[PDB]
Amino acid sequence: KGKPHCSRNPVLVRGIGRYSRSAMYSRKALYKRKYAALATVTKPVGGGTRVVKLRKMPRYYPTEDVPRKLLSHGKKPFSQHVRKLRASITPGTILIILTGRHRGKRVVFLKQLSSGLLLVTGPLSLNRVPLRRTHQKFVIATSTKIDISGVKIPKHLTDAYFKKKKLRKPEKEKYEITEQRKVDQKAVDSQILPKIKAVPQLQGYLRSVFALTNGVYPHKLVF
């Protein structure tokens, strides 16, 4: 066996390579790369030994069964889908949340998680929005950007980090802010907050909520 080699045909456009068949034929040196033509486990027992079937026939059969589906292609699971991000959402961009209890608040975009959801912070001390996931379709990307290129976001802050844990009821069960989250909030905030205060009137801008008022029309105004 040999180590995999990166494709020698760069992509020109999706589905079309840069090089033709004969061009690739030479690049791959195919002129010299020519080539020519358990179900049971035995166990001892206290007979002497028994041949044991690893998988047993069903003990039941429903009266009816559905047939097998026809085969398709291109229907991937969610985890294998490509994630897209609006070009207007770069790290350090200020976004306006449009849904949930934090609607109208202006928050700082940190990064896009593997699931495709965005990660944002208020920061908490400015508008009481913590490290929280938000969906890009439900945010307005303003044109205001702070430079958070030097901010080290903890690497454990992943989709699994922010996934909700189920709470059971038989009265009521209350969510609790784990001490780890508080520690993570301070670590990230301590780096973003000084950079927000570098821009005049920006911390006050982040404290203030977005709302439409008389005569103000979203299609007319720049964000």
């Binding site: 020519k34 080539y35 020519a36 033509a37």
Partner: peptide, 4 residues
């Protein structure tokens, strides 16, 4: 035959 040539290909192989």
């Amino acid at each position: 035959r040539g290909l192989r």
